[PDB]
Every structure is written in structure tokens, then in C-alpha cells.
Design a binder for this molecule. Structure first.
Ligand SMILES: NC(=O)c1ccc[n+]([C@@H]2O[C@H](COP(=O)([O-])OP(=O)(O)OC[C@H]3O[C@@H](n4cnc5c(N)ncnc54)[C@H](OP(=O)(O)O)[C@@H]3O)[C@@H](O)[C@H]2O)c1
Ligand SMILES: NC(=O)c1ccc[n+]([C@@H]2O[C@H](COP(=O)([O-])OP(=O)(O)OC[C@H]3O[C@@H](n4cnc5c(N)ncnc54)[C@H](OP(=O)(O)O)[C@@H]3O)[C@@H](O)[C@H]2O)c1
Ligand SMILES: C[C@H](CCC(=O)NCCC[N+](C)(C)CCCS(=O)(=O)[O-])[C@H]1CC[C@H]2[C@@H]3[C@H](O)C[C@@H]4C[C@H](O)CC[C@]4(C)[C@H]3C[C@H](O)[C@]12C
Ligand SMILES: C[C@@H]1CN(c2ccc([N+](=O)[O-])cc2)CCN1S(=O)(=O)c1ccc(C(C)(C)C)cc1
Lengths: 265, 263
């Protein structure tokens, strides 16, 4: 996967057709708004239409080349697959798939909640796979890009987020493996995994409101995510701590993977 | 917190161990090793005839008990029943060795969502269900949970995406609850094992074409899993090369988690 050795330029997204999921709020909404401000075509999704409409409206107000929404739950694999189709017609193509949404989750110990674990896998992980499969043909045409939004808990272990972490680890294991597949098959679709720390979205602020954890600004975060996709980077790291930003990489893993891949064929 | 001792076989003598996917491969050799130790075993898998055969050689080997209970971990109900059924058959549970996997598909991923889902269900979700159901008894003996995983559950490889997803998920989930059990003072240890190429028939069938590094003896591999589990180690790394286990360590992650919990 060859990234561009350029500096990012906001114009790179002008006229581009982009899906963003879980975009009625949080980092997703903020991504829609940056893409809007860049004059991109944008289709957003989430379960609730009212909140989605506001985003759509302000996107056009912000200068979006076009902007729509389709509401639905990503518990529905059928909705997921269909959403990408409807969204493809709407824009006449696809340059970028931004996979962002999660099921509602809050900090808690794990006792018996298999139903939360499975819904997490289904919504947080499986639905991302179904959306990728549904979007690849269009993405092969544009030579597009999959952006997968992940978490520190998707690279290291923390208490209170077991089912969430499982699903985020899964994303890494899956998409990191198909990136290597796309590179032998010579599929020219980039895959960017984003490892975010605590971000000041309203939901996240509510879920931790109860010690001191410094949150990072959602607007800058959203842009760092778009920048990584645009530039076809493998991983984007974003946290408020410089120590965390550093320690969340895995140089051992890069070396090993590189030795294996220039070794096997 | 590991046990501050050298391993000695008799630690397992009398203990109540479940071993899943124990009809063949590494699972089978763990049943056997635990048997020469004196443990009470109960194995499980889908293969009735073969389970029977192993259970029988376990009795010949020194085991204090040997029972099998065939079924598929695609079935969460049977997974839940199985631990209860096995708990009775033993009057307690000391060790839960979680090892089974669905059949892994060595190929480019294209559109088989159902195979991804099934990998997640069998390879990961069923491990959660089994653990949920074996907890109460594990708490009472202050027992151990062993989770078997792979090079491909720590780093990424092409051709095994669904499997890598499931093994990665094992790491997140069980590493997260390990930190939860420490702070809520649950005295149940958790061991994640990371295995390179082991010479099981399954593996050798899989790597037959290409030429790799020497595969490692499944009998040694199985014992090291039991050892680490017994000593309550957090992680066991096993490959025929020490270089592999050196290269696979991630000190960054260890330091970052130390930082988060001094806090
Ligand atoms: N903020 C953080 O501290 C943080 C940290 C690490 C990683 N991240 C990652 O950043 C991404 C965005 O998180 P956020 O904090 O911005 O969350 P958020 O503000 O809570 O936004 C979640 C979005 O997902 C949608 N959603 C929820 N359930 C859905 C379902 N079943 N089907 C379809 N859409 C659903 C929501 O809309 P509806 O409810 O209307 O459906 C909403 O638009 C996530 O992947 C998260 O893991 C965030
Ligand atoms: N061998 C290696 O090179 C290697 C490398 C990395 C990781 N590992 C890990 O080591 C563990 C064991 O590997 P192995 O090579 O020993 O595998 P194996 O020889 O293929 O045995 C897998 C076991 O799982 C059982 N199983 C399959 N589907 C099942 C289902 N639906 N329900 C219940 N049981 C099922 C199989 O029994 P039945 O068909 O009789 O049901 C079999 O006993 C796995 O977790 C694997 O990830 C091995
Ligand atoms: C053999 C490879 C890994 C080899 C590797 O990654 N090595 C490359 C170079 C590493 N080194 C730098 C150490 C060597 C170079 C310097 S050195 O001098 O040391 O060679 C590993 C990685 C993924 C593994 C499969 C999965 O588990 C799924 C499945 C589980 C079953 O149960 C058994 C079958 C199967 C198909 C597994 C078989 C095997 O187990 C695989 C292929
Ligand atoms: C540092 C943050 C927050 N984390 C966390 C973990 C544990 C606790 N705790 O109070 O024990 C508090 C916070 C988990 C890891 N990260 S994160 O950025 O991966 C993250 C942020 C927000 C969440 C939600 C879904 C709980 C809001 C989960 C993970």
C-alpha cells in the first residue's frame, strides 16, 4: 500500500464521493462537516433521521458538493449492504468509505452480557465487513479508500470495555489481513486504520464524566482521520498525550510482518 | 500474579480440567499430558468416535477421571450446558482450557460474510459463553482460564482474515477482563497462548505446498500451554524458534498499560 509522499491539501476531497457512518453526531458528524467544507459529495447514515437531517442541512450550508442521508440500524446486515447501493446511485460512484459507527456502550464490568458482546461484534465489526464487501466494486473503480475508525482499546487492553475492545481488536486483525491480501492481488484500494484516544464527543464525555482523563478535540481528530485516508496511510494515531501517541504503535509487529512478506510469496 | 515456583507435574494431580477441541491436534495432547499428571479431565469436540478413543487412552495413562461430551461450539446452548454437565461430572473445576477452532479457510477473502460470522461465533463468542458459564466454579477453586491463540492473533497475515479477526478478538476481550478481575479482586488467572507452526495434522495439511521453518512438536507445545496455565502466567509464547518469540513481544503495549493503571 503506497501512500502519497505529499502534504495533505484540502482540495484533494473536492468532488469526491464519500460515505460516513455514525455521522449524526460525534467524530462522524465532524467528518461530514470537514468534507462539506471541502466541497465533497457526502452521504451520511445513522439510525435517527431528524439528527441526520440537521447534519445534511449544515453540510450544504457549509459548501458540500452534494449531501444526503439514509437512516437505518447497522444491526441490519441487509440494511448495510443496501445502504451502500442506494448511496452509490445517489453520488454516481464511490471514492471513500469511512467506517465510524458503534453500538451504544458505556463503561461497565463484564459479568454475563453475551448479548452485548455479540451485538458489539455484529455492529462494531461484522457490519464493517458487509459494508466493505458491498462497496469494493465501486472502490476498485475509483481506486478508493476504506477508513476504519478504531481505538486505544483496539491496540491495548483496558478494564471496563471488554466487548468494545474485542470488536476493535477484530477490526485490526481483519482489515490488516485484507490489506496484505489487496497488496498481493494488486487491488488498488487503500485501508487506513485509525487509533483514537478519548475524544470530547458528547456521548464519550457523558460516559466518563464520572476521574481526570483529558479528552482531545473532536474537530481536529475528525480532520486527522480524513487526512490519513486521503494520504492512503495505514494507520493514523490521535490522542492528547504524546506518550500515548507513541506507545500505541507496534514497531515489533511491523518488522515481523515485513520479514514474513519479503520471505514467503 | 504468576506462581513463584518451577513447574512440577504433580501440581495438576487431582485438578479438574476441561479441554475443548480435544478430539485431535494440540487439544488431544493436552488431554494426554494432564492424564499422565493424574488430573480429572473432560474433553469435548464434535467427533464422538475419536473422543471415545482418547478418553480411553487417558484412563490407560494415569487420569483420575476421563469423560467426553460431543457437540458443536457453533451452539451457544450446548456450550453453556457443557460446562454445567462437566462441572457435575467432576465436582468442581480448576482449569478451563479453551482451544477449539472452526475449520480455517486459507484463501483470499472475497464475500463470505457467513464464514466470518461463524469464525467469530465458534472461535471467539463460544469462548466467552464457556467462560461466563464456568466462572462461578472457577472462582471457588480460584482457578485458571487458558486461551489458545496464534502468531496470527498478534500480527497480521494474508489468507487468514476471518481467523485473525477471531484470535485478535480473543486478545482484546480476555486481556480487558484480566484487568477487570484484578481490580475487582477476582482470583481467577487468565493465560493467552501465542503459538507458531505446530505439527498437527491440520497444520501440516495446511502448509503442505510451501516450505516453512521447522514445525514444532505438538507434545511439547501442549505441555508448555499447561505449564504456563498452571503457573498462572499471563502469556505463553511457543514456537520452534526463540527468535519468533523475541520478535513478537510488544514492550510498548506493556508500558502503556502500566501507565494507564498507575492512575
Ligand atoms: N469519542 C471517543 O472517546 C472515542 C475513542 C476511541 C474511539 N472512538 C471511535 O470513534 C468512533 C465515533 O465515536 P463517537 O464517540 O463519535 O460516538 P457517538 O458520538 O456516540 O456517535 C455514534 C454514531 O453512531 C450511530 N449509531 C449508534 N448505534 C447505531 C446503530 N446500531 N446503527 C447505525 N448507527 C448507529 C449514532 O447515531 P444513532 O444513535 O442515531 O443511530 C451516531 O451517529 C467510534 O468508532 C469509536 O469507537 C471514539
Ligand atoms: N497447529 C498450529 O500450527 C497452530 C498455529 C497457531 C495457532 N494454533 C491454535 O491451536 C489451537 C489448536 O490447533 P490445532 O492445530 O491443534 O487444531 P486441530 O488439530 O484442527 O483441532 C481443532 C479442534 O477443534 C475441534 N472443532 C472443530 N470445529 C468444532 C466445533 N464446531 N465445535 C467444537 N469443536 C470443534 C476439532 O474437533 P472436531 O472436528 O472433532 O469437532 C479439533 O479437535 C487452535 O486454537 C489454533 O488456533 C495452532
Ligand atoms: C506458519 C505461519 C507463520 C510463519 C511466520 O510468521 N514466520 C515468518 C518469518 C518469521 N521469522 C522472522 C521468525 C523468520 C525469519 C528469520 S528466521 O531465521 O527465524 O526464519 C502461521 C501463520 C498463520 C498460521 C495458520 C493460522 O494459525 C490458522 C490455522 C490454525 C491451525 O491450528 C493450524 C493451521 C493454520 C492454517 C495455521 C498454520 C501456521 O501455523 C500459520 C500459517
Ligand atoms: C482511554 C480511553 C477510555 N478508556 C477507559 C477505560 C477504563 C476507564 N475506567 O474508568 O476504568 C475509563 C476510561 C478506554 C480506552 N480509551 S478509548 O479512547 O479507547 C475509549 C473511549 C471511549 C469509550 C466509550 C465507548 C466507553 C465511550 C471506550 C474507549
Amino acid at each position: 500500500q503506497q501512500p502519497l509522499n505529499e502534504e495533505f491539501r484540502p482540495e484533494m476531497l473536492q468532488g469526491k464521493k464519500v460515505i460516513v457512518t455514525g455521522a449524526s453526531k460525534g467524530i462522524g458528524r465532524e467528518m461530514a462537516y470537514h468534507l462539506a467544507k471541502m466541497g465533497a459529495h457526502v452521504v451520511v447514515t445513522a439510525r435517527s433521521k431528524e439528527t441526520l437531517q440537521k447534519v445534511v442541512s449544515h453540510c450544504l450550508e457549509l459548501g458540500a458538493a452534494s449531501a444526503h442521508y439514509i437512516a437505518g440500524t447497522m444491526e441490519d446486515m441487509t440494511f448495510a449492504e443496501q445502504f451502500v447501493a442506494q448511496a452509490g446511485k445517489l453520488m454516481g460512484g464511490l471514492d471513500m468509505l469511512i467506517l465510524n459507527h458503534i453500538t451504544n456502550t458505556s463503561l461497565n464490568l463484564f459479568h454475563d452480557d453475551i448479548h452485548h458482546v455479540r451485538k458489539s461484534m455484529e455492529v462494531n465489526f461484522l457490519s464493517y465487513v458487509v459494508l466493505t464487501v458491498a462497496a469494493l466494486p465501486m472502490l476498485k473503480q475509483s481506486n478508493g479508500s476504506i477508513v476504519v475508525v478504531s481505538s486505544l482499546a483496539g491496540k491495548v487492553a483496558y478494564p471496563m470495555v471488554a466487548a468494545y475492545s474485542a470488536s476493535k481488536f477484530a477490526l485490526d486483525g481483519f482489515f490488516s489481513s485484507i490489506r496484505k491480501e489487496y497488496s498481493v492481488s494488486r487491488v488498488n484500494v487503500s485501508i487506513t486504520l485509525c487509533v483514537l484516544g478519548l475524544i470530547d464527543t458528547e456521548t464519550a464525555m457523558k460516559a466518563v464524566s464520572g476521574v481526570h482523563m483529558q479528552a482531545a478535540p473532536k474537530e481536529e481528530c475528525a480532520l486527522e482521520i480524513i487526512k490519513g485516508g486521503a494520504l492512503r496511510q495505514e494507520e493514523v494515531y490521535y490522542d492528547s498525550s504524546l506518550w500515548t501517541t507513541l506507545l500505541i504503535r507496534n514497531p515489533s509487529r511491523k518488522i515481523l510482518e515485513f520479514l514474513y512478506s519479503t520471505s514467503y510469496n
